[PDB]
Amino acid sequence: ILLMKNLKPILLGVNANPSMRIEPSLVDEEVKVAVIRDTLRLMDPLKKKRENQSQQL
Amino acid sequence: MREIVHIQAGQCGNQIGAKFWEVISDEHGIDPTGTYHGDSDLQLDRISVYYNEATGGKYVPRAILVDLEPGTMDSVRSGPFGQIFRPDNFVFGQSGAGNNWAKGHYTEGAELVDSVLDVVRKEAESCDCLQGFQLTHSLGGGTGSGMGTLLISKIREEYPDRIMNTFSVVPSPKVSDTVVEPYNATLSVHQLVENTDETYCIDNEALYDICFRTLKLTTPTYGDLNHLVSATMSGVTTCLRFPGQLNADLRKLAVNMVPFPRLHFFMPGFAPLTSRGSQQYRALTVPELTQQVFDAKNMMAACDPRHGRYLTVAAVFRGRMSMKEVDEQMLNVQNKNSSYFVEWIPNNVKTAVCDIPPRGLKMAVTFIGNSTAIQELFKRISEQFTAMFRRKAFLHWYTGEGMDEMEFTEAESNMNDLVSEYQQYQD
Amino acid sequence: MREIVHIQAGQCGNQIGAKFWEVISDEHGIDPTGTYHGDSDLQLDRISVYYNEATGGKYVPRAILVDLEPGTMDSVRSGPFGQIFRPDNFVFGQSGAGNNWAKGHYTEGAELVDSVLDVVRKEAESCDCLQGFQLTHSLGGGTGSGMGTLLISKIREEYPDRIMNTFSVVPSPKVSDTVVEPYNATLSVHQLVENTDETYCIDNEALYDICFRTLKLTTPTYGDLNHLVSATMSGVTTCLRFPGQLNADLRKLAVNMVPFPRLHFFMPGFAPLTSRGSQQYRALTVPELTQQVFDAKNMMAACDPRHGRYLTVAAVFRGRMSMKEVDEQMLNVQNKNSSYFVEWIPNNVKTAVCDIPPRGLKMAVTFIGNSTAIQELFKRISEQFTAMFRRKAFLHWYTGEGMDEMEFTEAESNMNDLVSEYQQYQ
Amino acid sequence: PTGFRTFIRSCKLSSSSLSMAAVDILYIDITRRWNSMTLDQRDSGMCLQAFVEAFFFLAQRKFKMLPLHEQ
Amino acid sequence: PVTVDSSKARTSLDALKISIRQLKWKEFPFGRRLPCDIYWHGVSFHDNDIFSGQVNKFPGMTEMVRKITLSRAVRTMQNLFPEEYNFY
Ligand SMILES: CC(=O)O[C@H]1C(=O)[C@@]2(C)[C@H]([C@H](OC(=O)c3ccccc3)[C@]3(O)C[C@H](OC(=O)[C@H](O)[C@@H](NC(=O)c4ccccc4)c4ccccc4)C(C)=C1C3(C)C)[C@]1(OC(C)=O)CO[C@@H]1C[C@@H]2O
Ligand SMILES: CC(=O)O[C@H]1C(=O)[C@@]2(C)[C@H]([C@H](OC(=O)c3ccccc3)[C@]3(O)C[C@H](OC(=O)[C@H](O)[C@@H](NC(=O)c4ccccc4)c4ccccc4)C(C)=C1C3(C)C)[C@]1(OC(C)=O)CO[C@@H]1C[C@@H]2O
Numbered sequence A: 001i002l003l004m005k006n007l008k009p010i011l012l013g014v015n016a017n018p019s020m021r022i023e024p025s026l027v028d029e030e031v032k033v034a035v036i037r038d039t040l041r042l043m044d045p046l047k048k049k050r051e052n053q054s055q056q057l
Numbered sequence B: 001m002r003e004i005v006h007i008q009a010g011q012c013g014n015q016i017g018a019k020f021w022e023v024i025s026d027e028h029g030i031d032p033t034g035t036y037h038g039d040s041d042l043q044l045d046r047i048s049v050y051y052n053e054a055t056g057g058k059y060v061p062r063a064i065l066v067d068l069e070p071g072t073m074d075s076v077r078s079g080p081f082g083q084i085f086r087p088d089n090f091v092f093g094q095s096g097a098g099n100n101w102a103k104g105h106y107t108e109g110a111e112l113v114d115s116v117l118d119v120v121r122k123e124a125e126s127c128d129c130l131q132g133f134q135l136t137h138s139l140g141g142g143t144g145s146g147m148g149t150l151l152i153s154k155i156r157e158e159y160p161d162r163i164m165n166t167f168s169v170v171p172s173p174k175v176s177d178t179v180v181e182p183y184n185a186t187l188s189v190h191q192l193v194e195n196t197d198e199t200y201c202i203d204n205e206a207l208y209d210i211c212f213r214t215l216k217l218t219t220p221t222y223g224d225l226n227h228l229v230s231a232t233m234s235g236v237t238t239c240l241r242f243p244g245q246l247n248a249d250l251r252k253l254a255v256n257m258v259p260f261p262r263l264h265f266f267m268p269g270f271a272p273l274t275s276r277g278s279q280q281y282r283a284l285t286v287p288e289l290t291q292q293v294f295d296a297k298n299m300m301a302a303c304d305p306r307h308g309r310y311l312t313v314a315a316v317f318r319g320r321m322s323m324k325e326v327d328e329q330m331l332n333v334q335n336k337n338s339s340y341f342v343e344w345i346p347n348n349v350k351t352a353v354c355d356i357p358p359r360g361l362k363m364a365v366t367f368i369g370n371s372t373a374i375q376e377l378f379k380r381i382s383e384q385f386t387a388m389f390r391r392k393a394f395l396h397w398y399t400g401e402g403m404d405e406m407e408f409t410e411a412e413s414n415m416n417d418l419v420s421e422y423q424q425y426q427d
Numbered sequence C: 001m002r003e004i005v006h007i008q009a010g011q012c013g014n015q016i017g018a019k020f021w022e023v024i025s026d027e028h029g030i031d032p033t034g035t036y037h038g039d040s041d042l043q044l045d046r047i048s049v050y051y052n053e054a055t056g057g058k059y060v061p062r063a064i065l066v067d068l069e070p071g072t073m074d075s076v077r078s079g080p081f082g083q084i085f086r087p088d089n090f091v092f093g094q095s096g097a098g099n100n101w102a103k104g105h106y107t108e109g110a111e112l113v114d115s116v117l118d119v120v121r122k123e124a125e126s127c128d129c130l131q132g133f134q135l136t137h138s139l140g141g142g143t144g145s146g147m148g149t150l151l152i153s154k155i156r157e158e159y160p161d162r163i164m165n166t167f168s169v170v171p172s173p174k175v176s177d178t179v180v181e182p183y184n185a186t187l188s189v190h191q192l193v194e195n196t197d198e199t200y201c202i203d204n205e206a207l208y209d210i211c212f213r214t215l216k217l218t219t220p221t222y223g224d225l226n227h228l229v230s231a232t233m234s235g236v237t238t239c240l241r242f243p244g245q246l247n248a249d250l251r252k253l254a255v256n257m258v259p260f261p262r263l264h265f266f267m268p269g270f271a272p273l274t275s276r277g278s279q280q281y282r283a284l285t286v287p288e289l290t291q292q293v294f295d296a297k298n299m300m301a302a303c304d305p306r307h308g309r310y311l312t313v314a315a316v317f318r319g320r321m322s323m324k325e326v327d328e329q330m331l332n333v334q335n336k337n338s339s340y341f342v343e344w345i346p347n348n349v350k351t352a353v354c355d356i357p358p359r360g361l362k363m364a365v366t367f368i369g370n371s372t373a374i375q376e377l378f379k380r381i382s383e384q385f386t387a388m389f390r391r392k393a394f395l396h397w398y399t400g401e402g403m404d405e406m407e408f409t410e411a412e413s414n415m416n417d418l419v420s421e422y423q424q425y426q
Numbered sequence D: 001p002t003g004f005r006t007f008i009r010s011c012k013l014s015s016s017s018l019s020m021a022a023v024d025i026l027y028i029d030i031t032r033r034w035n036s037m038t039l040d041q042r043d044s045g046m047c048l049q050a051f052v053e054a055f056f057f058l059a060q061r062k063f064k065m066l067p068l069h070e071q
Numbered sequence E: 001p002v003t004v005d006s007s008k009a010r011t012s013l014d015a016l017k018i019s020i021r022q023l024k025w026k027e028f029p030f031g032r033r034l035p036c037d038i039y040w041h042g043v044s045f046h047d048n049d050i051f052s053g054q055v056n057k058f059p060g061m062t063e064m065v066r067k068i069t070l071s072r073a074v075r076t077m078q079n080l081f082p083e084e085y086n087f088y
């Protein structure tokens, strides 16, 4: 996204395979590692089972 | 230039193709060993259409012979004009698919279309400018219908620009050697609607009628029928091999022959046909030729054209004739039998003329007609199929190879859709 | 000028070399007695590339034949074209090292490598300009896979500036007649990667496939299999021995085959292999040779090129064809099958042309192909090796023959690194 | 083409104004245009974007004098 | 424990690994024959023949993020909604 001076965004390129390499770069690590951790947490295969068990109990 | 790839599948396809190659090789002066021994130069000017040129000026026919039973292949090899086919062009299986459409299309014939496609690609790339594919097969069997549909689909998936003309044998109401042949016939019409450009329909009843009435032959075997089919096959592609005054190729025929995309189910005929005890009491003239080609009995399909209207007809004269006679006589055909042609399309006749005549003759004609009566040739099948469906019979031989019940209903419904399409324009 | 010294090792090597020497002697027109009876002035111009001129118009090959079993020497000597060889080039042992790589690399080979190197030096020094050596062996035995590593390791340090080839036979998974054989292969690949300039992987099962499918041969033997290897060997060095439009010496082939030092494993092929009853049904042209040269069916290695992508391709044509036809055919391959080609090498094919065709034939090609799919072979052996190494199997022989446990692990690490680095460029 | 004709016969978009011949002509023209548009010239069949174009044309034919979003 | 396949992570390997260690999930750096809960590919969805579990690649996204396909979709939507889709 290119942010215009009048704060209107412009969508440039889109990437199916963004560079997830963190090298070390503190900013790249802090962003990407957290992104993948949140990704994995959002889709733990046992979360649905745990929620169903909690609702049943 | 304009090379044509030939494919034969099934017993009937293999035998008809063998007769066809024997017929052409006589016309281009090819020996059963491959060498050229001919009198006219014109024969060796477009041998590239059907033949590849190997070393030592020996010409190999561009044909592919496929079947799921090895035995028939030997029959092709150990016959006249038999040691000309390329040894690697014989692709074959172990069991002949029975009379199972499912076996050929799905289970046992699927492990052979890969080899057939490999040979097809190899042949199709040594050609300068391909024109199309022509295939001889017989609807009603297992390897014929199934393997032909699979092969045809897999080729239009790869060459969706060439011309696919099919010479196919259709089930007959009187003559019948199979009890599950309506099933295969219905399962195949559908694939021929959206995967071929021209479809020539042949039935053994019509060929037997021709051999019994016109020629007055005592014991007509399969040889005579294959001979007639070879005659009409050679006659259609003549304006690509020899020169003339109104040359018309396969694409021109399709353009003048098919007004709507699904309406490409023609019916064939060959004009000069007499007994052996009558060739001296009749004069071989253009009027007699054009009178015999439009005769209802002299038609190689078991549908009466008087019960419908001709959408369009194409005639391909061969020999030395005057244009005026051709135009006048095939204009007078459409002023007399005027009720047998549709009115929304004026001038329902396409005329081509090739100079060179067939060997041993002076004038010959090949007739291709698109008329609505062909609907009957399908209609009967539906009836038979229906009788075998409500009391589901022999369906386990088909459902035991992966075919669902829904495919039968879809194929049948497509058949009535085509019949209704042919019917609506007649009224 | 520019002569090559030939070395044969093991039974497989000796038999392949005997067939090759019969082939070359027929090509150059050499009597089995050693005389020249041939009708050409070009068969004797570069004859000083395999042969040596003895007294009275006698020609004797280089042909250093080695074995630890004295049976193959007797088989070669009493045999077609078997007295064509110098009597003292036969360096033979007393026991065939079993099927033990340790025996032929550490104990039995050591007591014979010096004897071999004496005659190797004696021949080399009688050369005007030594282009290099070439070794024929198999990577599944003890004598072959051990001698062809020890000898190559000591020949490379003595002549680092020369050229070294190897027509090795890589063991096959299906056609297997030896149990310990993977071990030997795992212990050889890591020495056949830093001690030889080229290496040709000749898998036996591919030769059987060619014999069964292309040649329609009901009952093939080892001679039929060695015929193809000899044909490829002759086609590799034709441009050093006969004139051409575009010559290609061995070093010229090396310079445009290996993009990186350790990527020197190739796939051979021979263009006009047809049958005996399909010949009449074919036309001998450039396009058809290029079609039966690039197919995953005419290849003498058991790995599908469709699984990887070529890094480079050679094509030593032999015949009196035209250059425009060859260039046009090469441009079509590359344009047709674009996916099966590395993007960062434009025009991956290196061509060559030699006028003189093999006798009888009027046209032939020898396809050399560096492909990433070759990694399959290595990754097909390592697994087997691991299957036999986690539970120590048959290892008492190697351990008691002087080796130690760490050599096996080092060899596996080297082979795994080779597979990974070949996969890197895919 | 069978898919298009089944769609037309199912959602009853065909009428006196738009017969089967017109539908076939539209399908042929759209398919040819989109096949020629792509770098590869085979494109045997119809992609999704061509279907979007066909749906746009059909929606233009019906509900005349209406905004495109309503169409 | 959740099993994650990282044999095809490529540039996402390291950033994933610590994350895998942050969730106390147990990894397959070299993969396995048995089905895995989550498969992490780097470039293409067709990297591995997956029949069950989860994969970090939707099919065909390599082609969709290409410039001409995204542009075609954007112009289609701009025809559908010009005012809304003015960002491109
Ligand atoms: C005594 C005599 O006159 O015999 C002639 C002949 O003219 C008759 C009997 C022939 C003859 O045909 C038949 O008797 C016949 C019987 C059953 C099935 C097919 C043919 C003939 O066989 C057919 C043959 O025709 C040809 O040669 C054509 O070129 C024809 N056939 C071949 O080229 C051919 C080549 C090799 C082997 C067999 C036939 C052809 C026509 C158009 C396109 C391609 C080929 C000829 C002159 C004869 C015989 C030999 C009796 C007829 O030939 C055709 C099919 O036009 C049948 O009616 C015509 C005209 C004649 O009556
Ligand atoms: C029926 C016929 O024409 O027979 C031919 C022949 O052309 C065929 C059958 C030959 C023949 O080869 C084989 O039968 C064969 C069998 C197993 C494995 C390999 C070959 C032939 O043996 C091979 C031989 O080729 C040669 O002479 C080459 O020069 C060849 N010679 C030798 O290898 C050789 C060497 C020493 C003693 C005897 C032969 C050669 C090839 C490359 C480099 C140098 C030499 C020829 C013309 C024939 C026969 C005799 C059947 C073929 O030979 C090659 C490898 O080019 C096999 O396919 C080709 C082409 C043909 O099909």
Ligand SMILES: Nc1nc2c(ncn2[C@@H]2O[C@H](COP(=O)(O)CP(=O)(O)OP(=O)(O)O)[C@@H](O)[C@H]2O)c(=O)[nH]1
Pocket: B009, B010, B011, B012, B013, B015, B016, B069, B096, B097, B098, B099, B138, B139, B140, B141, B142, B143, B144, B145, B169, B177, B204, B222, B225, B226
């Ligand atoms: N006009 C001809 N009809 C033939 C010929 N040979 C067979 N047929 C007829 O064709 C029909 C189908 O029989 P085939 O055995 O040729 C069909 P197919 O090969 O597809 O069956 P399978 O080999 O059992 O799979 C049947 O009515 C036969 O009588 C022939 O040479 N000419």
Ligand SMILES: Nc1nc2c(ncn2[C@@H]2O[C@H](COP(=O)(O)CP(=O)(O)OP(=O)(O)O)[C@@H](O)[C@H]2O)c(=O)[nH]1
Pocket: C009, C010, C011, C012, C013, C015, C016, C068, C069, C096, C097, C098, C099, C100, C104, C138, C140, C141, C142, C143, C144, C145, C169, C176, C177, C178, C204, C222, C225, C226
């Ligand atoms: N193409 C050929 N392959 C061969 C030949 N002899 C053996 N082999 C194959 O190679 C392997 C065995 O090769 P050899 O017996 O020549 C090995 P060598 O004698 O050098 O080892 P030792 O057992 O230590 O003496 C095995 O896979 C055989 O099938 C041959 O003459 N030709």
Ligand SMILES: [Mg+2]
Pocket: B011, B069, B096
């Ligand atoms: Mg049969």
Ligand SMILES: [Mg+2]
Pocket: C010, C011, C069, C096, C141, C143
């Ligand atoms: Mg031995």
